[PDB]
Design an enzyme around this catalytic site. Structure first.
Site, PDB file in Angstrom:
ATOM      1  N   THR A 267       0.926  -1.284   0.080  1.00  0.00           N
ATOM      2  CA  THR A 267      -0.099   0.038   0.070  1.00  0.00           C
ATOM      3  C   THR A 267       0.869   1.351   0.044  1.00  0.00           C
ATOM      4  OG1 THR A 267      -0.343   0.163   2.370  1.00  0.00           O
ATOM      5  CG2 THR A 267      -1.955  -1.110   1.091  1.00  0.00           C
ATOM      6  N   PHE A 392      -9.082   5.827   2.542  1.00  0.00           N
ATOM      7  CA  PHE A 392      -8.627   4.704   3.393  1.00  0.00           C
ATOM      8  C   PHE A 392     -10.122   4.111   4.033  1.00  0.00           C
ATOM      9  CE2 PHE A 392      -5.009   7.877   3.637  1.00  0.00           C
ATOM     10  CZ  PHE A 392      -4.331   6.937   3.735  1.00  0.00           C
ATOM     11  N   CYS A 399      -9.308   2.219   7.193  1.00  0.00           N
ATOM     12  CA  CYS A 399      -7.536   1.776   7.234  1.00  0.00           C
ATOM     13  C   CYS A 399      -7.242   2.046   8.918  1.00  0.00           C
ATOM     14  CB  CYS A 399      -6.977   2.443   6.508  1.00  0.00           C
ATOM     15  SG  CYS A 399      -5.181   1.933   6.478  1.00  0.00           S
TER      16      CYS A 399
HETATM   17  C1  HEM Z   1      -1.110   4.290   1.624  1.00  0.00           C
HETATM   18  C2  HEM Z   1      -1.523   3.216   2.409  1.00  0.00           C
HETATM   19  C3  HEM Z   1      -2.716   2.556   2.613  1.00  0.00           C
HETATM   20  C4  HEM Z   1      -4.105   2.489   2.106  1.00  0.00           C
HETATM   21  C5  HEM Z   1      -4.399   3.489   0.923  1.00  0.00           C
HETATM   22  C6  HEM Z   1      -4.755   1.895   2.796  1.00  0.00           C
HETATM   23  C7  HEM Z   1      -5.984   1.622   2.359  1.00  0.00           C
HETATM   24  C8  HEM Z   1      -7.068   0.880   3.232  1.00  0.00           C
HETATM   25  C9  HEM Z   1      -8.657   0.813   3.034  1.00  0.00           C
HETATM   26  C10 HEM Z   1      -9.485   1.333   1.552  1.00  0.00           C
HETATM   27  C11 HEM Z   1      -8.952  -0.071   3.877  1.00  0.00           C
HETATM   28  C12 HEM Z   1     -10.381  -0.388   3.889  1.00  0.00           C
HETATM   29  C13 HEM Z   1     -10.591  -1.818   3.088  1.00  0.00           C
HETATM   30  C14 HEM Z   1     -11.849  -2.239   3.055  1.00  0.00           C
HETATM   31  O1  HEM Z   1     -13.113  -1.506   3.263  1.00  0.00           O
HETATM   32  O2  HEM Z   1     -12.348  -3.485   2.950  1.00  0.00           O
HETATM   33  C15 HEM Z   1      -7.928  -0.458   4.681  1.00  0.00           C
HETATM   34  C16 HEM Z   1      -8.018  -1.157   5.730  1.00  0.00           C
HETATM   35  C17 HEM Z   1      -7.019  -1.671   6.555  1.00  0.00           C
HETATM   36  N1  HEM Z   1      -5.843  -1.089   6.332  1.00  0.00           N
HETATM   37 FE1  HEM Z   1      -4.963   0.064   5.157  1.00  0.00          FE
HETATM   38  N2  HEM Z   1      -4.141   1.212   3.882  1.00  0.00           N
HETATM   39  C18 HEM Z   1      -3.109   1.708   3.693  1.00  0.00           C
HETATM   40  C19 HEM Z   1      -1.827   1.227   4.763  1.00  0.00           C
HETATM   41  C20 HEM Z   1      -1.960   0.405   5.762  1.00  0.00           C
HETATM   42  C21 HEM Z   1      -0.942   0.173   6.566  1.00  0.00           C
HETATM   43  C22 HEM Z   1       0.610   0.676   6.593  1.00  0.00           C
HETATM   44  C23 HEM Z   1      -1.445  -0.649   7.726  1.00  0.00           C
HETATM   45  C24 HEM Z   1      -0.827  -1.376   8.599  1.00  0.00           C
HETATM   46  C25 HEM Z   1       0.500  -1.433   8.898  1.00  0.00           C
HETATM   47  C26 HEM Z   1      -2.820  -0.817   7.232  1.00  0.00           C
HETATM   48  C27 HEM Z   1      -3.776  -1.534   7.817  1.00  0.00           C
HETATM   49  C28 HEM Z   1      -5.173  -1.743   7.577  1.00  0.00           C
HETATM   50  C29 HEM Z   1      -6.044  -2.831   8.175  1.00  0.00           C
HETATM   51  C30 HEM Z   1      -5.526  -3.636   9.380  1.00  0.00           C
HETATM   52  C31 HEM Z   1      -7.341  -2.679   7.576  1.00  0.00           C
HETATM   53  C32 HEM Z   1      -8.576  -3.302   8.027  1.00  0.00           C
HETATM   54  C33 HEM Z   1      -8.963  -2.445   9.357  1.00  0.00           C
HETATM   55  C34 HEM Z   1     -10.496  -2.980   9.904  1.00  0.00           C
HETATM   56  O3  HEM Z   1     -11.423  -3.346   9.034  1.00  0.00           O
HETATM   57  O4  HEM Z   1     -10.584  -3.033  11.137  1.00  0.00           O
HETATM   58  N3  HEM Z   1      -3.096  -0.276   6.021  1.00  0.00           N
HETATM   59  N4  HEM Z   1      -6.962   0.048   4.378  1.00  0.00           N
HETATM   60  N1  GQR Z   2      -4.343  -1.663   4.094  1.00  0.00           N
HETATM   61  C1  GQR Z   2      -5.563  -2.622   3.480  1.00  0.00           C
HETATM   62  C2  GQR Z   2      -5.769  -2.078   2.059  1.00  0.00           C
HETATM   63  C3  GQR Z   2      -5.017  -3.150   1.005  1.00  0.00           C
HETATM   64  C4  GQR Z   2      -4.627  -4.279   2.078  1.00  0.00           C
HETATM   65  C5  GQR Z   2      -3.818  -5.239   1.600  1.00  0.00           C
HETATM   66  C6  GQR Z   2      -3.673  -6.216   2.623  1.00  0.00           C
HETATM   67  C7  GQR Z   2      -3.938  -5.814   3.783  1.00  0.00           C
HETATM   68  C8  GQR Z   2      -4.678  -4.695   4.376  1.00  0.00           C
HETATM   69  C9  GQR Z   2      -4.769  -3.838   3.199  1.00  0.00           C
END
Ligand code: HEM
Ligand code: GQR
Ligand code: ZP6
Length: 454
Positions: A267, A392, A399
């Site tokens: 990401t 996000f 996120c």
């Molecule tokens: C530019 C970087 C990132 C973008 C654009 C991004 C984007 C997203 C998006 C769109 C979702 C929602 C997914 C859904 O609704 O199915 C999400 C969920 C998540 N992301 Fe990220 N993410 C980024 C970086 C990261 C990083 C660095 C981490 C952890 C170290 C992370 C951990 C998570 C987790 C654990 C979820 C699930 C949260 C939950 O539903 O409780 N993300 N992210």
């Molecule tokens: N950060 C989200 C959005 C894309 C991705 C992929 C693996 C695990 C978590 C996530």
């Protein structure tokens, strides 16, 4: 009540062959440009609806009406990500439990704690580029992936992937990339029980085993040592959910660490790569961002407070996320029978897909210039309507990593702009590779050091 348009069909396979491409998100974006704010998408035994307008997405983001769905991609990734935060249903006990335990680990305040570790990896990136010879270039997504993977390994579980010491990835990473490719390849397979795919299935189980074995060993090693390092693994071994009063068990901790390693690898590296792409294609913006980096980052090591002052660098990152949101689609289901947009009746359980790149190109929100890279659109966040900008995701399922990703991306882009001038020496033509996430494949630049010491 309107009938939704639907793209071209392939008899009994319905729309499924439209995903027989290495660029499925870009294909869906071109379908949205042809069909508009909503279209029906059908596969054998599957119906979903792709949304593109802020008008419809603002309703989809009503948490009283819609909850997170696991798309087919997420169901396949759940085979190795398990009931970690990203691949859990909201109603699974381990979702709200892990969410309550991990939220304070991911807060803006917690970024003060991770900063020193982020600086360690960021300085490795700057030193790599300082040490290039005059004739040499940078492989941008390759180096940004080295960086983001190393940052999450160190802040996650005090593990050094040492990606800057390697041509070839860590064995964990080879299995993780191959497991992800297999999950993504399975989507378009009209016939997945075919014996051709027996090698894929044997290999998939071997990659799942490799991932579980290193992560289980890292948890077991930390429990054995008793060491109290300020990383996510310590917070997960010690943390208790205020609601249940329970800690996470070792299996769920393993799914969380696997989830965080995929997110870091896939990401933030994309965001930084797209940001550098847009900067080299828009020299006025590059100049404005480099003036801020030079004025703010006055010390050889950036401080947490200095990274918070990089406002224009933040706007560059948000404009990159607007055009190429790195994680470009999320899935929702209707909690009850409901009417979307006063026009599209849905039944309880009906699925929606949010096409984030298309939301980010809604001319009724951003104006006619939507394809232009203009960070100044973000100069006043108050001027962006609710649910117009969703890189996000949405609500309690947004996120968890957002503060972490933006802190790392702002620090690293700040240091890059302070330390180097950049040249688009090949006049690179954007080619966007798709996994779960987007990255600009083959993106190369030359950096000329400004010779400012670390
Ligand atoms: C530019 C970087 C990132 C973008 C654009 C991004 C984007 C997203 C998006 C769109 C979702 C929602 C997914 C859904 O609704 O199915 C999400 C969920 C998540 N992301 Fe990220 N993410 C980024 C970086 C990261 C990083 C660095 C981490 C952890 C170290 C992370 C951990 C998570 C987790 C654990 C979820 C699930 C949260 C939950 O539903 O409780 N993300 N992210
Ligand atoms: N950060 C989200 C959005 C894309 C991705 C992929 C693996 C695990 C978590 C996530
Ligand atoms: O996986 C899905 O269900 C859909 C594609 C599909 C497959 C079969 C029938 C109908 C639709 N997936 C998608 O539309 C997008 C594009 C390709 C992968 N994808 C997706 O949602 O990946 C999971 C993901 C990535 C990033 C952030 C959250 C979730």
């Amino acid at each position: 009540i309107k009938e939704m348009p639907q793209p071209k069909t392939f008899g009994e396979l319905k729309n499924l062959p439209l995903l027989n491409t290495d660029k499925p998100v870009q294909a869906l974006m071109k379908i949205a440009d042809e069909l508009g704010e909503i279209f029906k998408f059908e596969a054998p035994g599957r119906v979903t609806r792709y949304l593109s307008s802020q008008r419809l997405i603002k309703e989809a983001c009503d948490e009283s009406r819609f909850d997170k769905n696991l798309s087919q991609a997420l169901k396949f990734v759940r085979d190795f990500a398990g009931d970690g935060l990203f691949t859990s249903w909201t109603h699974e006990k381990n979702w709200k439990k892990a969410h309550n335990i991990l939220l304070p680990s991911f807060s803006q305040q917690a970024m003060k704690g991770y900063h020193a570790m982020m600086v360690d990896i960021a300085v490795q990136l700057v030193q790599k580029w300082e040490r290039l010879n005059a004739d040499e270039h940078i492989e941008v997504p390759e180096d940004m992936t080295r960086l983001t993977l190393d940052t999450i390994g160190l802040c996650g579980f005090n593990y050094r992937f040492n990606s800057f010491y390697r041509d070839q990835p860590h064995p964990f990473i080879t299995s993780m990339v191959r497991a992800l490719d297999e999950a993504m390849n399975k989507l378009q397979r009209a016939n997945p029980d075919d014996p051709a795919y027996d090698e894929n299935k044997r290999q998939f189980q071997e990659d799942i085993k490799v991932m579980n074995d290193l992560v289980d060993k890292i948890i077991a090693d930390r429990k054995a040592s008793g060491e109290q390092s300020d990383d996510l693994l310590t917070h997960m071994l010690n943390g208790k959910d205020p609601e249940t009063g329970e800690p996470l068990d070792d299996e769920n901790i393993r799914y969380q660490i696997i989830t965080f390693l995929i997110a870091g690898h896939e990401t933030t590296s994309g965001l930084l790569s797209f940001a550098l792409y847009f900067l080299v294609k828009n020299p006025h913006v590059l100049q404005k961002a480099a003036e801020e980096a030079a004025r703010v980052l006055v010390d050889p090591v950036p401080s947490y407070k200095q990274v918070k002052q990089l406002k224009y660098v933040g706007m560059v990152l948000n404009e990159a996320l607007r055009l190429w949101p790195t994680a470009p689609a999320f899935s929702l289901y209707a909690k009850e029978d409901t009417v979307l947009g006063g026009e599209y009746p849905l039944e309880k359980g009906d699925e929606l897909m949010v096409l984030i790149p298309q939301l980010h190109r809604d001319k009724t929100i951003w104006g006619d210039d939507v394809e232009e890279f203009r960070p100044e659109r973000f100069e006043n966040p108050s001027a962006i309507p609710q649910h117009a900008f969703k890189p996000f995701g949405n609500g309690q399922r947004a996120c968890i990593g957002q503060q972490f990703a933006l802190h790392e991306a702002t620090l690293v882009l700040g240091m890059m702009l302070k330390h180097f001038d950049f040249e688009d020496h090949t006049n690179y033509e954007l080619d966007i590779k798709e996994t779960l996430t987007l990255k600009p494949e083959g993106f190369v630049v030359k950096a000329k050091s400004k010779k400012i010491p670390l």
